[PDB]
Amino acid sequence: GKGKPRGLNSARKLRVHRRNNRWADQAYKARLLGTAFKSSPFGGSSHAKGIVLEKIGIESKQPNSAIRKCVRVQLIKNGKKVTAFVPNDGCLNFVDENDEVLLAGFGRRGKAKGDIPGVRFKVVKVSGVSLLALWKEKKEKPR
Amino acid sequence: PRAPRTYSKTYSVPKRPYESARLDAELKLAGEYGLKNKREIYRIGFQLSKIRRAARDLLTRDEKDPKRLFEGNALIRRLVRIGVLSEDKMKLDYVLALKPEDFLERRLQTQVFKLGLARSIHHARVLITQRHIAVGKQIVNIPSFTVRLDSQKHIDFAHNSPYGGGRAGRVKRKNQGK
Amino acid sequence: GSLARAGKVKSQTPKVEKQEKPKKPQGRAYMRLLYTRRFVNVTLTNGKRKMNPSPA
Amino acid sequence: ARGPKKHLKRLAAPSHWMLDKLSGTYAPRPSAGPHKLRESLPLVVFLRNRLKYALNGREVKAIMMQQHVQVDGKVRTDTTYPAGFMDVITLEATNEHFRLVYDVKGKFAVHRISAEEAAYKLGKVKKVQLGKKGVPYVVTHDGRTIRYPDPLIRANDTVKIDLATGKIDDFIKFDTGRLVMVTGGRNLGRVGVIVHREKHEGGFDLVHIKDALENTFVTRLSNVFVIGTEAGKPWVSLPKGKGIKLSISEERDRRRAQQG
Amino acid sequence: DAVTIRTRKVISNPLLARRQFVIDVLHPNRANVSKDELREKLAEIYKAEKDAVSVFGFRTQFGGGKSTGFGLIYQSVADAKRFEPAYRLVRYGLAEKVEKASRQQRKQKKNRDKKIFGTQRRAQKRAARRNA
RNA sequence: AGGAUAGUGGCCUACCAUGGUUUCAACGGGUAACGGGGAAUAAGGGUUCGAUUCCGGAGAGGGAGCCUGAGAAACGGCUACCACAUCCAAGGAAGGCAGCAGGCGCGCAAAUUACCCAAUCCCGACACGGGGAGGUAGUGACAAUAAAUAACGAUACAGGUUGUAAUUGGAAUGAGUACAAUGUAAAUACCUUAACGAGGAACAAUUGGAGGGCAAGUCUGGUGCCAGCAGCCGCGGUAAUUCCAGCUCCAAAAGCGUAUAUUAAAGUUGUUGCAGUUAAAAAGCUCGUAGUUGAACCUUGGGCUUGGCUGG
């Protein structure tokens, strides 16, 4: 009845069974295996500083037809090269090649967002100044 | 080093953020009480919920339990002291029958309005923060100062307040002296 | 794709200076300001109530 | 670790000292002495926190340097001297004689006694054993060694110390019906009479005691101190409450009746 | 202005040869009452020397007009000085403030004297002979 | 049996047996592992965290060995090597901030080379010295508490005895600014407080949005599958309720978004409490060991007396 042990001396069989079946859960599996510590470009971090290498315009996924303007950034903490989005009408002009850009997530937590193919990060600050403050022109880029 | 000094929150934001049924009700409750923000409602909501939580445990107990007694009456005595519980409602069941409107009725801002010292409920808060009303012989400028039953009758204008026999304020002195 | 079109729209938007307006009340007064306009002097269209009705 | 500690954090102090949390980081560490650190009271605590004679830890030190403080009829110059149970503190400048005895609430009550009563003490016999050259002796609760006691004295008994000559005036045998004051556990401070001593060989013996209000409690023999030979005749002036433990409701009702 | 002072929680302290209590001050229409004037006032009430009385820890309640402090009167001026700390004696003018170097200056000297053995006179004399 | 130890003990030695641990998970590996008291979240059961105000332990660059001493295998004690590293007159000499402040590097990530033993306590030959222990101040939107940016009239139209919407006032007050007093080891600050300090009372409140979820426009102009927005569904191909601007309005308010991780949501880890014919999932089928679970049955009833607390 119910297929799982119920006898009073069967607390062990339940302890092993649950712990085995928590591995099918990806939240548990990602945490214990430490895949963030190994294969995630930030290394489990929230933000990261990196160095811009080249600027790229990407064709959009269907059915949207546009260009998402991202950049090739190499990370200073571990030397990895991954693409980051530049989100603001006309904020491609604020970022130049070989600038240090503070990146963050898309809120999808390691997943591609929307119609943008192959990109998971966005630029938060350039040269130590927020790209939102530059888009609103609250401040000016240091140069 | 030194022993830590404890602190704790007094309010809790609701789970569901935008619900016009709740959104209008909180505006309605604060609007006629002149409350500054929703935190003053989140404060009454959180503080009242724990009063129920204390009473909820005791009602699960068997009656004549000395914890249910000693803790039960000790909670009730505090509530009647400030007037939120009626003097004929000392059964620990009427404590569950409480509402936010009960204790907000006990506030300094509310009661100075009902004692007529300020024309409007918002003018009632103004008399408080501008240091004009003295309870007993101690000047209180806390809008949320809960007034006990014995402190109910001793609310009046401060003797050094310009509205209470003190000298004229800054504006009157400058103009009458101009 | 080409990066030439970045910022095309905001560049060609005509500039509009915001009209200078009186400051609104803060604190309990804005709390007082809303409470009247929503529950006291009702502007509902006989059970039809819209909060920001665009002109028509 | 490399040696004994000489410091005591404020939170690490014994709970019964009622030391406030925000006075500072450290608390008075009792020196070695007649009583164990956790079951004793530094003199700096007593003259500042209970009597309020000294407003801070500096003022107490000058007090003892003028030789007013006497513990059991002898001068002490250590601010952190570990006074303990039944200890007599005399401040003759104030003409005050003290005996440290537990209140019912478990803490050191301020108990003023007469000048005559300050000239004796009672001690719990820890062991009777033969010392060097065939001289038996007795160790009391405060570590006193009295040579040549009454050969009838055995363990768990209470003797009367003349507190001047260090000799034995009289003793109280341990038996059923003996008046007892408890000095440990959550039954600490209670006073009552023995009903039945249950012997547990190889372990801890328990003493069954009935309180003054026909209240029965069971406590370990290590906390049991005899104060009188029968019920209602204690050899020392018992503090307020007479070791009678009440309910919280009764305390509230007594509080309600007392001030209103 | 009609400064009224009240006393409570009195404790006799012959160990410090002092009487101590709580100074309850009623000072309506006044910012607060100074230590100097309180000692001048307190001395007349209790017929003691103004130099053997101590007043400190005065804080005004919320709304003003009433202050609370601690009071210490000693059986003599001489008794006060033995049991009063230096700073209070400086506050009442009964003694001079100690003149010494700063804690940074005193500490630097002490580790510098740790570099000398014997009399400091010997150390400099031997320096002259070596450098001669 | 002995040695060594402060002492027990393969702790070590000599001799002699072949023992000891393990599917009830030994042994090995990883640990983004110091442990606990505790923290976050929680109807409950639970899940994640715990370097870190307390307790216990370990370490002072990595090892190793000792002196003194009751107490150390000590590092603000030494000796030696390894790795760095300072002066050098080139012979030599001196190192150890994982103490306080402070300097470089690393990063997404973290304070002044301030003052003082006055408070707490410790150490000493000790009423007297010392204490970057400790306390105070400087930076600090880590968090938490309380809590300002207005109020009431008179006109005035609308309006159902008054809720206001505009132009008309006289008050009140702290934000701040300062005698002074208090506060303190001395100061800063708080509180009290003379005098100054509000009509745009410019002494100006912000953070996000307004298709749905989800609260708040089908308003105007700009672009025209482009720029871009959009957590998801999608919006944009010339009337865009969704981009770019203005106006209006909404939610919270000295606070409001973003990213990451985690908890609730999640009865999507299910002991409480999931599912397994067809959506993922009953071993091809029997035997079988550990494990889990295992029919019923052995003084009941009767009788009498008595103590206690509930309703009267």
JSON list of C-alpha atoms in Angstrom, two decimals, chain D residues 46-218:
[
{"chain": "D", "resi": 46, "resn": "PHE", "atom": "CA", "xyz": [28.43, 42.25, 45.72]},
{"chain": "D", "resi": 47, "resn": "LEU", "atom": "CA", "xyz": [29.54, 45.78, 46.68]},
{"chain": "D", "resi": 48, "resn": "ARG", "atom": "CA", "xyz": [28.55, 47.26, 43.30]},
{"chain": "D", "resi": 49, "resn": "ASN", "atom": "CA", "xyz": [25.57, 45.31, 41.95]},
{"chain": "D", "resi": 50, "resn": "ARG", "atom": "CA", "xyz": [23.66, 44.35, 45.11]},
{"chain": "D", "resi": 51, "resn": "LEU", "atom": "CA", "xyz": [24.50, 46.89, 47.83]},
{"chain": "D", "resi": 52, "resn": "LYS", "atom": "CA", "xyz": [25.17, 49.68, 45.29]},
{"chain": "D", "resi": 53, "resn": "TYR", "atom": "CA", "xyz": [27.74, 51.12, 47.70]},
{"chain": "D", "resi": 54, "resn": "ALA", "atom": "CA", "xyz": [30.23, 51.39, 44.82]},
{"chain": "D", "resi": 55, "resn": "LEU", "atom": "CA", "xyz": [29.07, 52.88, 41.54]},
{"chain": "D", "resi": 56, "resn": "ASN", "atom": "CA", "xyz": [31.79, 51.18, 39.49]},
{"chain": "D", "resi": 57, "resn": "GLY", "atom": "CA", "xyz": [34.57, 48.62, 39.76]},
{"chain": "D", "resi": 58, "resn": "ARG", "atom": "CA", "xyz": [37.16, 51.20, 40.77]},
{"chain": "D", "resi": 59, "resn": "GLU", "atom": "CA", "xyz": [35.40, 52.40, 43.93]},
{"chain": "D", "resi": 60, "resn": "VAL", "atom": "CA", "xyz": [35.18, 48.91, 45.45]},
{"chain": "D", "resi": 61, "resn": "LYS", "atom": "CA", "xyz": [38.96, 48.46, 45.39]},
{"chain": "D", "resi": 62, "resn": "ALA", "atom": "CA", "xyz": [39.53, 51.49, 47.62]},
{"chain": "D", "resi": 63, "resn": "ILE", "atom": "CA", "xyz": [36.94, 50.08, 50.04]},
{"chain": "D", "resi": 64, "resn": "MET", "atom": "CA", "xyz": [38.88, 46.88, 50.66]},
{"chain": "D", "resi": 65, "resn": "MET", "atom": "CA", "xyz": [42.20, 48.73, 50.90]},
{"chain": "D", "resi": 66, "resn": "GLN", "atom": "CA", "xyz": [40.84, 50.45, 54.02]},
{"chain": "D", "resi": 67, "resn": "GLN", "atom": "CA", "xyz": [40.36, 47.01, 55.63]},
{"chain": "D", "resi": 68, "resn": "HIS", "atom": "CA", "xyz": [36.60, 47.28, 56.21]},
{"chain": "D", "resi": 69, "resn": "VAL", "atom": "CA", "xyz": [35.58, 44.09, 54.41]},
{"chain": "D", "resi": 70, "resn": "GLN", "atom": "CA", "xyz": [35.91, 40.89, 56.44]},
{"chain": "D", "resi": 71, "resn": "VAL", "atom": "CA", "xyz": [35.02, 37.42, 55.16]},
{"chain": "D", "resi": 72, "resn": "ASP", "atom": "CA", "xyz": [34.26, 35.12, 58.11]},
{"chain": "D", "resi": 73, "resn": "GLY", "atom": "CA", "xyz": [36.09, 37.41, 60.53]},
{"chain": "D", "resi": 74, "resn": "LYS", "atom": "CA", "xyz": [39.25, 37.81, 58.43]},
{"chain": "D", "resi": 75, "resn": "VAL", "atom": "CA", "xyz": [40.28, 40.61, 56.09]},
{"chain": "D", "resi": 76, "resn": "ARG", "atom": "CA", "xyz": [40.38, 40.06, 52.33]},
{"chain": "D", "resi": 77, "resn": "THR", "atom": "CA", "xyz": [42.22, 42.36, 49.92]},
{"chain": "D", "resi": 78, "resn": "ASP", "atom": "CA", "xyz": [41.14, 40.67, 46.66]},
{"chain": "D", "resi": 79, "resn": "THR", "atom": "CA", "xyz": [38.27, 42.42, 44.88]},
{"chain": "D", "resi": 80, "resn": "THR", "atom": "CA", "xyz": [37.37, 39.14, 43.13]},
{"chain": "D", "resi": 81, "resn": "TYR", "atom": "CA", "xyz": [37.51, 36.97, 46.24]},
{"chain": "D", "resi": 82, "resn": "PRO", "atom": "CA", "xyz": [35.04, 34.09, 45.75]},
{"chain": "D", "resi": 83, "resn": "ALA", "atom": "CA", "xyz": [32.56, 34.45, 48.58]},
{"chain": "D", "resi": 84, "resn": "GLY", "atom": "CA", "xyz": [30.05, 31.62, 48.66]},
{"chain": "D", "resi": 85, "resn": "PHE", "atom": "CA", "xyz": [27.32, 29.79, 50.54]},
{"chain": "D", "resi": 86, "resn": "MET", "atom": "CA", "xyz": [26.92, 30.60, 54.27]},
{"chain": "D", "resi": 87, "resn": "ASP", "atom": "CA", "xyz": [29.88, 32.99, 53.98]},
{"chain": "D", "resi": 88, "resn": "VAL", "atom": "CA", "xyz": [29.84, 35.87, 56.47]},
{"chain": "D", "resi": 89, "resn": "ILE", "atom": "CA", "xyz": [30.69, 39.33, 55.14]},
{"chain": "D", "resi": 90, "resn": "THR", "atom": "CA", "xyz": [31.08, 42.01, 57.80]},
{"chain": "D", "resi": 91, "resn": "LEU", "atom": "CA", "xyz": [31.31, 45.72, 56.97]},
{"chain": "D", "resi": 92, "resn": "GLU", "atom": "CA", "xyz": [31.79, 47.07, 60.49]},
{"chain": "D", "resi": 93, "resn": "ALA", "atom": "CA", "xyz": [32.09, 50.64, 59.16]},
{"chain": "D", "resi": 94, "resn": "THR", "atom": "CA", "xyz": [28.39, 50.41, 58.27]},
{"chain": "D", "resi": 95, "resn": "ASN", "atom": "CA", "xyz": [27.82, 48.09, 61.26]},
{"chain": "D", "resi": 96, "resn": "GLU", "atom": "CA", "xyz": [26.36, 45.41, 58.99]},
{"chain": "D", "resi": 97, "resn": "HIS", "atom": "CA", "xyz": [26.76, 41.64, 59.19]},
{"chain": "D", "resi": 98, "resn": "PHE", "atom": "CA", "xyz": [25.88, 39.52, 56.17]},
{"chain": "D", "resi": 99, "resn": "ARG", "atom": "CA", "xyz": [25.35, 35.85, 55.43]},
{"chain": "D", "resi": 100, "resn": "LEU", "atom": "CA", "xyz": [25.21, 34.71, 51.79]},
{"chain": "D", "resi": 101, "resn": "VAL", "atom": "CA", "xyz": [22.19, 32.40, 51.55]},
{"chain": "D", "resi": 102, "resn": "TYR", "atom": "CA", "xyz": [20.05, 31.66, 48.52]},
{"chain": "D", "resi": 103, "resn": "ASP", "atom": "CA", "xyz": [16.64, 33.19, 48.15]},
{"chain": "D", "resi": 104, "resn": "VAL", "atom": "CA", "xyz": [13.95, 30.92, 46.75]},
{"chain": "D", "resi": 105, "resn": "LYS", "atom": "CA", "xyz": [14.49, 32.51, 43.32]},
{"chain": "D", "resi": 106, "resn": "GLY", "atom": "CA", "xyz": [17.92, 30.86, 42.98]},
{"chain": "D", "resi": 107, "resn": "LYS", "atom": "CA", "xyz": [20.04, 34.00, 43.40]},
{"chain": "D", "resi": 108, "resn": "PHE", "atom": "CA", "xyz": [22.21, 35.42, 46.18]},
{"chain": "D", "resi": 109, "resn": "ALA", "atom": "CA", "xyz": [19.81, 37.31, 48.41]},
{"chain": "D", "resi": 110, "resn": "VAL", "atom": "CA", "xyz": [20.99, 40.28, 50.47]},
{"chain": "D", "resi": 111, "resn": "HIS", "atom": "CA", "xyz": [20.44, 38.85, 53.95]},
{"chain": "D", "resi": 112, "resn": "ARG", "atom": "CA", "xyz": [21.40, 41.00, 56.93]},
{"chain": "D", "resi": 113, "resn": "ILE", "atom": "CA", "xyz": [22.06, 39.08, 60.14]},
{"chain": "D", "resi": 114, "resn": "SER", "atom": "CA", "xyz": [22.82, 40.04, 63.72]},
{"chain": "D", "resi": 115, "resn": "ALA", "atom": "CA", "xyz": [26.35, 40.75, 64.93]},
{"chain": "D", "resi": 116, "resn": "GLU", "atom": "CA", "xyz": [26.33, 37.60, 67.07]},
{"chain": "D", "resi": 117, "resn": "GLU", "atom": "CA", "xyz": [25.09, 35.40, 64.22]},
{"chain": "D", "resi": 118, "resn": "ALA", "atom": "CA", "xyz": [28.04, 36.62, 62.12]},
{"chain": "D", "resi": 119, "resn": "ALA", "atom": "CA", "xyz": [30.40, 34.79, 64.50]},
{"chain": "D", "resi": 120, "resn": "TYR", "atom": "CA", "xyz": [29.62, 31.26, 63.31]},
{"chain": "D", "resi": 121, "resn": "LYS", "atom": "CA", "xyz": [29.00, 29.34, 60.10]},
{"chain": "D", "resi": 122, "resn": "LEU", "atom": "CA", "xyz": [27.75, 25.94, 58.96]},
{"chain": "D", "resi": 123, "resn": "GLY", "atom": "CA", "xyz": [29.67, 23.64, 56.66]},
{"chain": "D", "resi": 124, "resn": "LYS", "atom": "CA", "xyz": [28.74, 20.48, 54.78]},
{"chain": "D", "resi": 125, "resn": "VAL", "atom": "CA", "xyz": [31.12, 17.61, 55.52]},
{"chain": "D", "resi": 126, "resn": "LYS", "atom": "CA", "xyz": [32.63, 16.41, 52.24]},
{"chain": "D", "resi": 127, "resn": "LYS", "atom": "CA", "xyz": [34.89, 13.59, 53.46]},
{"chain": "D", "resi": 128, "resn": "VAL", "atom": "CA", "xyz": [36.14, 12.10, 56.71]},
{"chain": "D", "resi": 129, "resn": "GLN", "atom": "CA", "xyz": [39.58, 10.58, 56.18]},
{"chain": "D", "resi": 130, "resn": "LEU", "atom": "CA", "xyz": [42.71, 9.90, 58.23]},
{"chain": "D", "resi": 131, "resn": "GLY", "atom": "CA", "xyz": [45.49, 12.41, 57.66]},
{"chain": "D", "resi": 132, "resn": "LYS", "atom": "CA", "xyz": [49.19, 12.12, 58.39]},
{"chain": "D", "resi": 133, "resn": "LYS", "atom": "CA", "xyz": [50.29, 10.46, 61.64]},
{"chain": "D", "resi": 134, "resn": "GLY", "atom": "CA", "xyz": [46.84, 8.94, 62.14]},
{"chain": "D", "resi": 135, "resn": "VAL", "atom": "CA", "xyz": [44.97, 12.24, 62.52]},
{"chain": "D", "resi": 136, "resn": "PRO", "atom": "CA", "xyz": [41.46, 12.08, 61.01]},
{"chain": "D", "resi": 137, "resn": "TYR", "atom": "CA", "xyz": [40.03, 15.33, 59.72]},
{"chain": "D", "resi": 138, "resn": "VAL", "atom": "CA", "xyz": [37.03, 16.78, 57.88]},
{"chain": "D", "resi": 139, "resn": "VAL", "atom": "CA", "xyz": [36.72, 18.83, 54.69]},
{"chain": "D", "resi": 140, "resn": "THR", "atom": "CA", "xyz": [33.74, 21.18, 54.59]},
{"chain": "D", "resi": 141, "resn": "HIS", "atom": "CA", "xyz": [31.97, 22.67, 51.58]},
{"chain": "D", "resi": 142, "resn": "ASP", "atom": "CA", "xyz": [34.32, 25.69, 51.60]},
{"chain": "D", "resi": 143, "resn": "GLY", "atom": "CA", "xyz": [37.40, 23.46, 51.80]},
{"chain": "D", "resi": 144, "resn": "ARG", "atom": "CA", "xyz": [38.11, 24.03, 55.49]},
{"chain": "D", "resi": 145, "resn": "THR", "atom": "CA", "xyz": [40.19, 21.33, 57.18]},
{"chain": "D", "resi": 146, "resn": "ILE", "atom": "CA", "xyz": [39.22, 20.77, 60.82]},
{"chain": "D", "resi": 147, "resn": "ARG", "atom": "CA", "xyz": [41.48, 18.36, 62.66]},
{"chain": "D", "resi": 148, "resn": "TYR", "atom": "CA", "xyz": [40.25, 16.15, 65.49]},
{"chain": "D", "resi": 149, "resn": "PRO", "atom": "CA", "xyz": [36.48, 16.32, 64.91]},
{"chain": "D", "resi": 150, "resn": "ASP", "atom": "CA", "xyz": [33.88, 14.39, 66.83]},
{"chain": "D", "resi": 151, "resn": "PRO", "atom": "CA", "xyz": [34.46, 10.74, 65.81]},
{"chain": "D", "resi": 152, "resn": "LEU", "atom": "CA", "xyz": [30.71, 10.48, 65.14]},
{"chain": "D", "resi": 153, "resn": "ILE", "atom": "CA", "xyz": [30.97, 12.95, 62.24]},
{"chain": "D", "resi": 154, "resn": "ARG", "atom": "CA", "xyz": [30.68, 11.32, 58.81]},
{"chain": "D", "resi": 155, "resn": "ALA", "atom": "CA", "xyz": [29.97, 12.37, 55.24]},
{"chain": "D", "resi": 156, "resn": "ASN", "atom": "CA", "xyz": [26.97, 14.50, 54.21]},
{"chain": "D", "resi": 157, "resn": "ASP", "atom": "CA", "xyz": [26.63, 15.93, 57.73]},
{"chain": "D", "resi": 158, "resn": "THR", "atom": "CA", "xyz": [26.59, 19.62, 58.68]},
{"chain": "D", "resi": 159, "resn": "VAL", "atom": "CA", "xyz": [28.89, 20.99, 61.38]},
{"chain": "D", "resi": 160, "resn": "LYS", "atom": "CA", "xyz": [28.83, 24.34, 63.16]},
{"chain": "D", "resi": 161, "resn": "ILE", "atom": "CA", "xyz": [32.06, 26.31, 62.79]},
{"chain": "D", "resi": 162, "resn": "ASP", "atom": "CA", "xyz": [32.95, 28.73, 65.57]},
{"chain": "D", "resi": 163, "resn": "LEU", "atom": "CA", "xyz": [34.31, 30.87, 62.71]},
{"chain": "D", "resi": 164, "resn": "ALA", "atom": "CA", "xyz": [36.99, 32.20, 65.08]},
{"chain": "D", "resi": 165, "resn": "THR", "atom": "CA", "xyz": [39.01, 29.25, 66.40]},
{"chain": "D", "resi": 166, "resn": "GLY", "atom": "CA", "xyz": [38.22, 27.11, 63.36]},
{"chain": "D", "resi": 167, "resn": "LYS", "atom": "CA", "xyz": [36.89, 24.40, 65.66]},
{"chain": "D", "resi": 168, "resn": "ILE", "atom": "CA", "xyz": [33.61, 22.51, 65.96]},
{"chain": "D", "resi": 169, "resn": "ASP", "atom": "CA", "xyz": [30.86, 23.81, 68.23]},
{"chain": "D", "resi": 170, "resn": "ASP", "atom": "CA", "xyz": [28.21, 21.27, 67.20]},
{"chain": "D", "resi": 171, "resn": "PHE", "atom": "CA", "xyz": [26.99, 19.36, 64.17]},
{"chain": "D", "resi": 172, "resn": "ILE", "atom": "CA", "xyz": [23.72, 18.15, 62.66]},
{"chain": "D", "resi": 173, "resn": "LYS", "atom": "CA", "xyz": [23.52, 14.50, 61.66]},
{"chain": "D", "resi": 174, "resn": "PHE", "atom": "CA", "xyz": [22.13, 13.66, 58.23]},
{"chain": "D", "resi": 175, "resn": "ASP", "atom": "CA", "xyz": [18.90, 11.66, 58.50]},
{"chain": "D", "resi": 176, "resn": "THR", "atom": "CA", "xyz": [15.19, 11.59, 57.73]},
{"chain": "D", "resi": 177, "resn": "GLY", "atom": "CA", "xyz": [13.31, 14.74, 58.68]},
{"chain": "D", "resi": 178, "resn": "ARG", "atom": "CA", "xyz": [16.42, 16.91, 58.76]},
{"chain": "D", "resi": 179, "resn": "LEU", "atom": "CA", "xyz": [15.86, 20.47, 57.62]},
{"chain": "D", "resi": 180, "resn": "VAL", "atom": "CA", "xyz": [17.57, 20.92, 54.26]},
{"chain": "D", "resi": 181, "resn": "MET", "atom": "CA", "xyz": [18.47, 23.87, 52.05]},
{"chain": "D", "resi": 182, "resn": "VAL", "atom": "CA", "xyz": [19.17, 22.98, 48.41]},
{"chain": "D", "resi": 183, "resn": "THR", "atom": "CA", "xyz": [22.22, 24.50, 46.70]},
{"chain": "D", "resi": 184, "resn": "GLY", "atom": "CA", "xyz": [21.98, 23.32, 43.09]},
{"chain": "D", "resi": 185, "resn": "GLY", "atom": "CA", "xyz": [19.73, 22.59, 40.16]},
{"chain": "D", "resi": 186, "resn": "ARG", "atom": "CA", "xyz": [16.43, 24.29, 39.53]},
{"chain": "D", "resi": 187, "resn": "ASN", "atom": "CA", "xyz": [15.37, 23.27, 43.05]},
{"chain": "D", "resi": 188, "resn": "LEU", "atom": "CA", "xyz": [18.11, 25.64, 44.19]},
{"chain": "D", "resi": 189, "resn": "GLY", "atom": "CA", "xyz": [17.14, 27.79, 47.17]},
{"chain": "D", "resi": 190, "resn": "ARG", "atom": "CA", "xyz": [14.30, 25.55, 48.35]},
{"chain": "D", "resi": 191, "resn": "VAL", "atom": "CA", "xyz": [14.11, 24.61, 52.04]},
{"chain": "D", "resi": 192, "resn": "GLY", "atom": "CA", "xyz": [12.47, 21.48, 53.36]},
{"chain": "D", "resi": 193, "resn": "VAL", "atom": "CA", "xyz": [12.73, 18.25, 55.30]},
{"chain": "D", "resi": 194, "resn": "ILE", "atom": "CA", "xyz": [14.07, 14.90, 54.11]},
{"chain": "D", "resi": 195, "resn": "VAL", "atom": "CA", "xyz": [11.50, 12.17, 53.50]},
{"chain": "D", "resi": 196, "resn": "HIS", "atom": "CA", "xyz": [13.49, 9.28, 52.00]},
{"chain": "D", "resi": 197, "resn": "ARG", "atom": "CA", "xyz": [17.08, 8.96, 50.80]},
{"chain": "D", "resi": 198, "resn": "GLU", "atom": "CA", "xyz": [17.20, 6.55, 47.84]},
{"chain": "D", "resi": 199, "resn": "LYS", "atom": "CA", "xyz": [20.63, 4.96, 47.51]},
{"chain": "D", "resi": 200, "resn": "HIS", "atom": "CA", "xyz": [22.00, 4.38, 44.01]},
{"chain": "D", "resi": 201, "resn": "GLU", "atom": "CA", "xyz": [25.29, 2.52, 44.40]},
{"chain": "D", "resi": 202, "resn": "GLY", "atom": "CA", "xyz": [27.89, 3.59, 41.86]},
{"chain": "D", "resi": 203, "resn": "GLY", "atom": "CA", "xyz": [25.86, 6.65, 40.86]},
{"chain": "D", "resi": 204, "resn": "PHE", "atom": "CA", "xyz": [24.15, 9.67, 42.43]},
{"chain": "D", "resi": 205, "resn": "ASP", "atom": "CA", "xyz": [21.91, 9.32, 45.46]},
{"chain": "D", "resi": 206, "resn": "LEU", "atom": "CA", "xyz": [18.72, 11.38, 45.54]},
{"chain": "D", "resi": 207, "resn": "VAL", "atom": "CA", "xyz": [17.17, 13.11, 48.55]},
{"chain": "D", "resi": 208, "resn": "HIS", "atom": "CA", "xyz": [13.37, 13.30, 48.70]},
{"chain": "D", "resi": 209, "resn": "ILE", "atom": "CA", "xyz": [12.28, 16.50, 50.45]},
{"chain": "D", "resi": 210, "resn": "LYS", "atom": "CA", "xyz": [8.87, 17.92, 51.34]},
{"chain": "D", "resi": 211, "resn": "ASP", "atom": "CA", "xyz": [8.62, 21.70, 51.23]},
{"chain": "D", "resi": 212, "resn": "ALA", "atom": "CA", "xyz": [6.88, 23.91, 53.78]},
{"chain": "D", "resi": 213, "resn": "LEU", "atom": "CA", "xyz": [3.67, 23.86, 51.71]},
{"chain": "D", "resi": 214, "resn": "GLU", "atom": "CA", "xyz": [3.60, 20.04, 51.37]},
{"chain": "D", "resi": 215, "resn": "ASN", "atom": "CA", "xyz": [5.52, 20.29, 48.09]},
{"chain": "D", "resi": 216, "resn": "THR", "atom": "CA", "xyz": [7.69, 17.30, 47.18]},
{"chain": "D", "resi": 217, "resn": "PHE", "atom": "CA", "xyz": [10.84, 17.50, 45.07]},
{"chain": "D", "resi": 218, "resn": "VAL", "atom": "CA", "xyz": [13.67, 15.09, 44.29]}
]
